[PDB]
Amino acid sequence: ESADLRALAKHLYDSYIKSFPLTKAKARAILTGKTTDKSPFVIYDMNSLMMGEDKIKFEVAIRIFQGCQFRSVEAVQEITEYAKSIPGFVNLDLNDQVTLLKYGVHEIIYTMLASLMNKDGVLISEGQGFMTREFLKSLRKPFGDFMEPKFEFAVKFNALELDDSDLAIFIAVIILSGDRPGLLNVKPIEDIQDNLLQALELQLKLNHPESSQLFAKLLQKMTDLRQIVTEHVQLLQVIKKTETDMSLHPLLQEIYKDL
């Protein structure tokens, strides 16, 4: 039955709008400056950064880091609320609900971060900002390579033309994974994933019939995510060695057990 999967697909688009205030659509309207309804403040060097706050309400490299760490937590809270709305997620072994979040969360961040990105920068601060890719690359040595990996992935990723209804199910799929180290009841997690996967596959053919082997292409990107996360996890640690100036958030370092 296919009309069962269209229920699950439209259901996860309701949760997605309810759990994530800035969608890809709202972000496209902003990034497509042809919709110059209310443009954002471009931050392209250290001088336009200091002018950022005064206007778009908020060392530079540390200050930008602590910024993306403020949104990181506001994403896990939205992800986590979205995690709860995936059928059967609340009924799972609550010890594995933590394992699902711990390993799956950054992968959703980078997925949805690609929405706010294009070749040149990233929508920041509810879409009121737009920090430049080059400015970020031209940061201090340990940070000149913090966002660039994500910008390279997002360019490959956004070429799939996924929309919010698409992304929703793909988001659920990533969350529900058996691969995660330390899962207890691996069996009931895989049961629901196959539902989402089936739901994903059908949603993709309906909304993108004129691109065959798209459901194919998307899943290869699910493993590309784990490389971003890993490499980012380990580069976040060598900075913890040289930068005792930093105080990383509780929630983030609660999940930042590497490997």
Partner 1 sequence: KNHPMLMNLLKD
Q: Is 72 annotated for ligand binding?
A: yes
Q: Which helix (H) or strand (E) holds 131?
A: strand 129-132
Candidates 36-44, 75-83, 167-175, 200-208: pick the segment binding partner 1 (CB under 8 A).
Answer: 75-83
Q: Is 70 annotated for ligand binding?
A: yes
Q: Is 39 annotated for ligand binding?
A: no
Residue closer to partner 1, measured from CB, 100 or 122: 100
Is 255 near partner 1 (CB under 8 A)? Answer: yes
Residue closer to partner 1, measured from CB, 49 or 76: 76
Residues 93-122 that bind partner 1 (CB under 8 A): 94-95, 97-98, 101-102
Binding residues for partner 1, total number by CB under 8 A? 17
Is 76 near partner 1 (CB under 8 A)? Answer: yes
Q: What share of residues in the chain are helix, strand, coil (percent, to 5)? A: 65, 5, 30
Residue closer to partner 1, measured from CB, 101 or 239: 101
* SS3 call for 234: helix
Q: Is 237 annotated for ligand binding?
A: no
Q: Phi and psi of 80, rounded to 5°? A: -60, -40
Is 85 near partner 1 (CB under 8 A)? Answer: no
Residue closer to partner 1, measured from CB, 76 or 199: 76
* SS3 call for 115: helix
Q: Could you write out the DSSP letters of every residue in 55-76?
A: HS---HHHHHHHHHHHHHHHHH
Is 77 near partner 1 (CB under 8 A)? Answer: yes
Question: What's the CA gap between 244 and 239, in Å, rounded?
Answer: 9
Question: What's the CA gap between 146 and 65, in Å, rounded?
Answer: 9
Q: Is 106 annotated for ligand binding?
A: yes
Burial class (CB in 10 A: 0-12, 13-18, 19+), 176: buried
**Cβ-contact 69, 249 below 8 angstroms:** yes
* SS3 call for 37: coil
Is 74 near partner 1 (CB under 8 A)? Answer: no
Q: Is 143 annotated for ligand binding?
A: no
Selected binder of partner 1 within 81, 134, 161, 179 (CB under 8 A)? 81
Residue closer to partner 1, measured from CB, 138 or 253: 253
Question: What's the CA gap between 155 and 126, in Å, rounded?
Answer: 21
Q: Is 232 annotated for ligand binding?
A: yes
Which residues belong to the annotated binding site for rosiglitazone? 69-72, 106, 232, 256
Which residues belong to the annotated binding site? 69-72, 106, 232, 256
Q: What residues make contact with partner 1 under the rule CB under 8 A? A: 76-77, 80-81, 83-84, 90, 94-95, 97-98, 101-102, 250-251, 254-255
